């Protein structure tokens, strides 16, 4: 009647509830499959995580689980179930069960032209989800096409909160060329200059990059290394203004920028000659050099480009902000145990 199913060598140890597994994808995180859920009689996504190796994997696993279990929003992927062993001793893998989707925006953009109506709907759903995330004082910190799931009718859900943080604007300042973890092409210029990425404006940048990418099917700032990223950004925005430069108090960052030859702004309408002019106005406001002047998520939702969809009464916010590293291996494993206990018999 049963006996562990397997996919591409991996044990997939999720029965008897979930059967008829089929491979979907793989990555550093581990392996995602589709599976038939014998209780809800629908196929689901299931990902196998095996993080008890180093405490960075456990950290990303804890953020993912705590954040997704607390959030409840149409444009954010949920967690439906979590499978692990009944004891901490016996627990080696964690399986996380989620709604099955058709594709993601990365896969779709590599193959498919988006109509302006698709671009607009996708952007609306991205911002609607992000409004909820930011309302909970959380930053996603790794928005990119691969982290946007789409079902067969183009409903969009933000996924992967493994790099999320609680916002902390008072502690955002740092030095020049301070190392960073989130995905290079979607990093706002201030990351390379003086920002730890602890402000909501980090995410708006990333969304801006996504919007550009939906317009041309090409990443807008495809830098090949840390500082190369800034140089792509400045190649298009042009040299920052005196005022914007004056806002960078850190001398190493400020003097770097002063060292560069003047560069002119590339007009959006020349980069995206097929784009809706309202789209390019919002793009401009999202890809603003100076993070203080960068448009916020609720202003973005109110922008004329999104007028067909905007309805703040149907753009919900979180009930309460989050306020949940210095924690040993053993304690991180215990917390993953405790957090997943609600799904055990
Ligand atoms: O949520 C995720 N995937 C996902 C979910 C639901 C879905 N429904 N439908 C789909 C779908 C259907 C068809 N085509 C494409 C997609 C789908 C995909 C991804 C997989 C992983 N997840 C992040 C996550 O689970 N985190 C916790 C674990 N973290 C982690 C843990 C261990 C390692 C690691 N690395 C190296 C060695 C060992 N462990 C790395 C990251 C990363 C964040 C984002």
Curated annotation (Swiss-Prot):
Please describe, based on the UniProt annotation, the reported consequence of changing residue 316 to R.
In NS13; results in increased MAPK signaling; increased translocation to the nucleus; reduced interaction with DUSP6; no effect on interaction with MAP2K1
Q: What PTM annotation applies here?
A: Phosphorylated upon KIT and FLT3 signaling. Dually phosphorylated on Thr-178 and Tyr-180, which activates the enzyme. Undergoes regulatory phosphorylation on additional residues such as Ser-239 and Ser-241 in the kinase insert domain (KID) These phosphorylations, which are probably mediated by more than one kinase, are important for binding of MAPK1/ERK2 to importin-7 (IPO7) and its nuclear translocation. In addition, autophosphorylation of Thr-183 was shown to affect the subcellular localization of MAPK1/ERK2 as well. Ligand-activated ALK induces tyrosine phosphorylation.
Swapping residue 311 to N leads to an effect described as: Inhibits interaction with MAP2K1 but not with TPR
Show the InterPro entries listed in the entry: Kinase-like_dom_sf, MAP_kinase, MAP_kinase_CS, MAPK_ERK1/2, Prot_kinase_dom, Protein_kinase_ATP_BS, Ser/Thr_kinase_AS
- What outcome is documented for mutating residue 167 to V in this protein? In NS13; results in increased MAPK signaling; increased translocation to the nucleus; reduced interaction with DUSP6; no effect on interaction with MAP2K1
Positions that bind ATP? 24-32, 47
Query: Is Membrane one of the keywords UniProt gives this record?
Result: yes
Phosphotyrosine: which positions carry it?
180
- Compartments reported by the entry: Cytoplasm, Cytoskeleton, Spindle; Nucleus; Cytoplasm, Cytoskeleton, Microtubule organizing center, Centrosome; Cytoplasm
Q: What EC number(s) does its UniProt record assign? A: 2.7.11.24
According to the UniProt record, what happens if one changes residue 178 to A?
Inhibits interaction with TPR
Q: Which positions form S-S bridges?
A: none
What residues are annotated to bind DNA? 252-270
Q: Which GO terms describe its biological process?
A: apoptotic process; B cell receptor signaling pathway; Bergmann glial cell differentiation; cardiac neural crest cell development involved in heart development; caveolin-mediated endocytosis; cell surface receptor signaling pathway; cellular response to amino acid starvation; cellular response to tumor necrosis factor
- Residue numbers covered by motif TXY: 178-180
Q: What is this protein called?
A: Mitogen-activated protein kinase 1
Q: Which organism is it from?
A: Homo sapiens (Human)
Whichever gene encodes this chain, its name is MAPK1
């Amino acid at each position: 009647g049963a006996g562990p199913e397997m996919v591409r060598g991996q044990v997939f140890d999720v029965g008897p509830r979930y059967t008829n597994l089929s491979y979907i994808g793989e990555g550093a995180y581990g392996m995602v499959c589709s599976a038939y859920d014998n209780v809800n009689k629908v196929r689901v996504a299931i990902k196998k995580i095996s993080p008890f190796e180093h405490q960075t994997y456990c950290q990303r696993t804890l953020r993912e689980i705590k954040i997704l279990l607390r959030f409840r929003h149409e444009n954010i992927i949920g967690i439906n179930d979590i499978i692990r062993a009944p004891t901490i001793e016996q627990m080696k893998d964690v399986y996380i069960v989620q709604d099955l989707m058709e594709t993601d925006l990365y896969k779709l953009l590599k193959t498919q032209h988006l109509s302006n109506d698709h671009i607009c709907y996708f952007l609306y759903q991205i911002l609607r989800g992000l409004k909820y995330i930011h309302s909970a004082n959380v930053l996603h910190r790794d928005l990119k096409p691969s982290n946007l799931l789409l079902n067969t009718t183009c409903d969009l859900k933000i996924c992967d909160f493994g790099l999320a943080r609680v916002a902390d604007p008072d502690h955002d300042h740092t030095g020049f060329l301070t190392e960073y973890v989130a995905t290079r092409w979607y990093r706002a210029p201030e990351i390379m200059l003086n920002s730890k990425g602890y402000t909501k404006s980090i995410d708006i940048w990333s969304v801006g990059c996504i919007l550009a990418e939906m317009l041309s099917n090409r990443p807008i700032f495809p830098g090949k290394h840390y500082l190369d990223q800034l140089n792509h950004i400045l190649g298009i925005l042009g040299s920052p203004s005196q005022e914007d430069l004056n806002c960078i108090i850190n001398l190493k960052a400020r003097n770097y920028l002063l060292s560069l030859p003047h560069k002119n702004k590339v007009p959006w309408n020349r980069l995206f000659p097929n784009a809706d002019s309202k789209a390019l106005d919002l793009l401009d406001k999202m890809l603003t050099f100076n993070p203080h002047k960068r448009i916020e998520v609720e202003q973005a939702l109110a922008h004329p480009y999104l007028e067909q969809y905007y309805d703040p009464s149907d753009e919900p916010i979180a009930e309460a902000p989050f306020k949940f590293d210095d924690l040993p291996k053993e304690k991180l494993k215990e917390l993953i145990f405790e957090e997943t206990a609600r799904f055990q018999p």
